[PDB]
Amino acid sequence: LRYHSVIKVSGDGGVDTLRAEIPVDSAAKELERIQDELYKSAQAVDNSPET
Amino acid sequence: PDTTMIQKLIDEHNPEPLLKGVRYYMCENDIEKKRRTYYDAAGQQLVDDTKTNNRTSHAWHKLFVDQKTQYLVGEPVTFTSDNKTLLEYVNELADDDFDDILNETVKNMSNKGIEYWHPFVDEEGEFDYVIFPAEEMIVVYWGRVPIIPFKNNEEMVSDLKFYKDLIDNYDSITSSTMDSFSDFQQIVYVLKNYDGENPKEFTANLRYHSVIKVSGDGGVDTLRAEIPVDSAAKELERIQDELYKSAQAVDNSPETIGGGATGPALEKLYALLDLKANMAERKIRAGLRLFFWFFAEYLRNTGKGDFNPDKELTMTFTRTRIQNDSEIVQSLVQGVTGGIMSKETAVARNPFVQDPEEELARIEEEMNQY
Amino acid sequence: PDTTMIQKLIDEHNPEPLLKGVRYYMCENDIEKKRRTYYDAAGQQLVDDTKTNNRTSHAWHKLFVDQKTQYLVGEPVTFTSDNKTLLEYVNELADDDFDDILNETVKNMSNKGIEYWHPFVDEEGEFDYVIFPAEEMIVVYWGRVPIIPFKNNEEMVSDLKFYKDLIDNYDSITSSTMDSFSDFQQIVYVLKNYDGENPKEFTANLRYHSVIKVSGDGGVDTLRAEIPVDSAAKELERIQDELYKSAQAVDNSPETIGGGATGPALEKLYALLDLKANMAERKIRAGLRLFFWFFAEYLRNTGKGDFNPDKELTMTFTRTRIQNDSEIVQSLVQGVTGGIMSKETAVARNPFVQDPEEELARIEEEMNQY
Ligand SMILES: [Ca+2]
Ligand SMILES: [Ca+2]
Ligand SMILES: [Hg+2]
Ligand SMILES: [Hg+2]
C-alpha cells in the first residue's frame, strides 16, 4: 500500500475506510453563543463591525 | 568579580524564550518541526519518504508587530522644552538615525519581550548609543547601571505570547489540508478477485494500457483521499478573527457592510490597537526618559551645561490614524459657524494641516490682503 | 592580505540564500523541481514517462516587488538644501541615470535581502558609481570601507522570506489540479469476465470500432480521474488573500462592495503597503546618506568645496497613491470657505497641482488682472 497503489483482496471481501468526523459546524455554532455570553458575563465592549 | 559565577550565569542563561518571537517574525514556526511518521515492525516510529510533508508557517506575527511598530514610531518623535539650548542638543542627537533605530527597538522589544540598548562615549569623544540585543544580556540587581531597558510589557514577554496558540493552530490546519491536496493525487486501488497471477502484469498493464483485467465476480474499487477544505475553511475563518482580537491589531480588509467610512466606524476599527499602543507608549517613554537622563549626565560632564530632562523636556508621539477628513472638515466648519469653536482650535484640528503655527499665520496675511 | 583565506572565504560563501528571491522574481519557483514518480520492482523511486508533469510557478513575488519598487522610487528623489552650490552638484549627479539605477537597487534589495553599490573615480577623473551585486560580495568588520550597503531589512532577508511558504502552496495546488485535468483524458477500463481470448483484439476493436465484446454476466466499468477544481478553488482563494497580507501589498482588483471610492476606503487599501514603504524608506535613506558622504569626500578632494550632506542636504520621496481628487477638492474648498484654512496650504494640498510655488503665483497674477 505504501509503495504501490494496491491492496489485494479475495473472497467476497473488500476494504472499508474509517475516517474521523470533524465537528466544525456544531462547534462553530456553539462557540458563537459562548463568545456572545463571554462579552456579557465579562461586562466588556465588542467593537466588531456592526452587520 | 568572579570568573566562575560568570560561567554559571552563562550556562544557566537561555535565549529560547526571547528568540521565540524572533523566529515567528521570520516565519520559522514550530510547525517547521512537523514530520509525517509511521510505525515499523516492532513499533519504531519512523518518518516516511512516501508522503510529502508540507509545513506552512504563517507571517501573522510579523504583520502584527510591524503594524504596532509603525503606529507608535513610524512618525518620528517630537520634543518640546522651554530650555532652548537643551532643545538644540536633543534635536541634533535625535531626529534621523535615532528614528530608524527606535523603530528597530520597538520591533525588537515586541519580538523579544525586552530590548536593551547601551550608551557610550565615542573614540572621537562624542556621545553615542548602540543596540544591545537582550538575548545576549544578563541582568541582576555614571552613578547608575550603564544600560537602558525598553520593556514590552511588565511581564517582559513577547507579544507572540498571547496568540502563539492561534498561529500554531492556523499553521496546523493549513498544512494538514495541504497534505490532503498532495495525497489526493495518489489513488489507491482495491483489487477484488483479480484475474492475473503475475504482479508484474498489473503495474505495466495499467500504466501503459488503459486496462485492468478482472475475473470472477470482483472488480476494482478506488480509495481516494478526502480533502477537508470546507471544514478547514470554516474554522480558519474564526481563528483568523480571533487572531486579530487576541493580538490587538487592525484589520483593514474591506468592509462588506456599508458603514465603515464614518467617524465611529473608524474609531471602532482601531480600538484594540489603540489599546495596545498606549501601553507600549508608556513603556517606551519610560526607557526613553532614562535615555535622556544619560544624555544629561554626558552634557554635565562634557561641560555643555547642567539640565533636568525629567522636568524640562517633553516628548510627543504621533499616530498614523485613518480618518474621514471629509467628515471632520465639515464638523469643524459647522462648529466654527455655530460659534462653539475658535478658528485657532479649528485650524489645529484640520486634517489638511501640518503646522498650526504657519497656517494660522498664513490665513491672517491672506485677510490683510483681501 | 592572504590568498589562502581568500579561498576559504570564497568556498565558505554561498549565494543560494541571496539568489532565492531572484529565482522567484523570474518564476523559477521550487515547484519547477516537482516530478511524477512511482516505484520499481524492489522499491526504486523513478520518474514515469506515462504522465504529464505540470509544474506552474506563480509570478506573485515579482508583482509585489515591482509594486514596492515603483511606490518608493518610481518618482525620482528630490533634494533640498540652503547651500546652493552643493544643491547644483547633487542634481547634476543624480536626477536621470541615478533614478534608473536606484529603481534597480530597490528591486534587487528585495530579491536578495541586501544590495551593495560601489563609488569610484572614472578614468576621465569624474565621480562614478556602479552596482556591486551582493551575491558576489563578502563582508567582514576614503577613510571608511569603500562600499555602500542598501539593506532590505535589519535581517537582510529577501521579502520572499515572509511569504514563500504561501507562493509554494499556491504553486503546489495549481499544478496538482493541472495534473488532474491532464489525467482525466486517459480513461482506464475495468474488464469484468472479458469475452475475447486475444489481447490484440481489444485494443484494436475499441480503437477502430465502437465495440467492446463481453460474455458471462460481466461488463465494462470505466475509471476516470476526479478533478478537485472546487476544493482547490476554495483554498486558493484564502491563500491569495493571505498572500496579499503576508506580503504587505495592495490589491486593486475591483470592489464587489460599493464603498471603495471614499477617502478612508482608499486609505485602508494602501494601509499595509504604506507600512512596508516606510521601513524600506528608512533603510534606503540610510544607504543614500552614506552615498552622499562619499560624494562629499570626492568634492573635498577634487577641490570643488567642503560640504556636510548629513546636515545641509534634505531628501524628498514621493508616493504614487490613489486618491479621490473630487472629494479632496471639495473638502479643501469647504475648508477655505469655512476659514479653517489658508489658500496657500490648500493650493499645496490640491491634487491638480504639481508645483505650489508656480500656482500660488499664477492665482495672484490672475487676480491683478481681474
Ligand atoms: Ca515551510
Ligand atoms: Ca513551469
Ligand atoms: Hg493564546
Ligand atoms: Hg510565511
mmCIF file of N, CA, C and O and ligand atoms in Angstrom, chain C residues 32 55-57, ligand 2:
data_model
loop_
_atom_site.group_PDB
_atom_site.id
_atom_site.type_symbol
_atom_site.label_atom_id
_atom_site.label_comp_id
_atom_site.label_asym_id
_atom_site.label_seq_id
_atom_site.Cartn_x
_atom_site.Cartn_y
_atom_site.Cartn_z
ATOM 1 N N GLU C 32 9.348 23.976 -9.755
ATOM 2 C CA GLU C 32 9.938 23.530 -11.013
ATOM 3 C C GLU C 32 10.708 22.205 -10.849
ATOM 4 O O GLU C 32 11.024 21.551 -11.836
ATOM 5 N N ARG C 55 4.253 21.717 -13.899
ATOM 6 C CA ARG C 55 4.703 22.493 -12.748
ATOM 7 C C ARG C 55 4.666 24.001 -12.994
ATOM 8 O O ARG C 55 5.598 24.587 -13.579
ATOM 9 N N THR C 56 3.562 24.606 -12.547
ATOM 10 C CA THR C 56 3.248 26.020 -12.786
ATOM 11 C C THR C 56 3.760 26.841 -11.624
ATOM 12 O O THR C 56 3.468 26.511 -10.480
ATOM 13 N N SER C 57 4.511 27.899 -11.892
ATOM 14 C CA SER C 57 5.140 28.632 -10.803
ATOM 15 C C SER C 57 4.720 30.058 -10.871
ATOM 16 O O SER C 57 4.943 30.691 -11.886
HETATM 17 CA CA CA D 2 6.915 25.793 -15.205
#
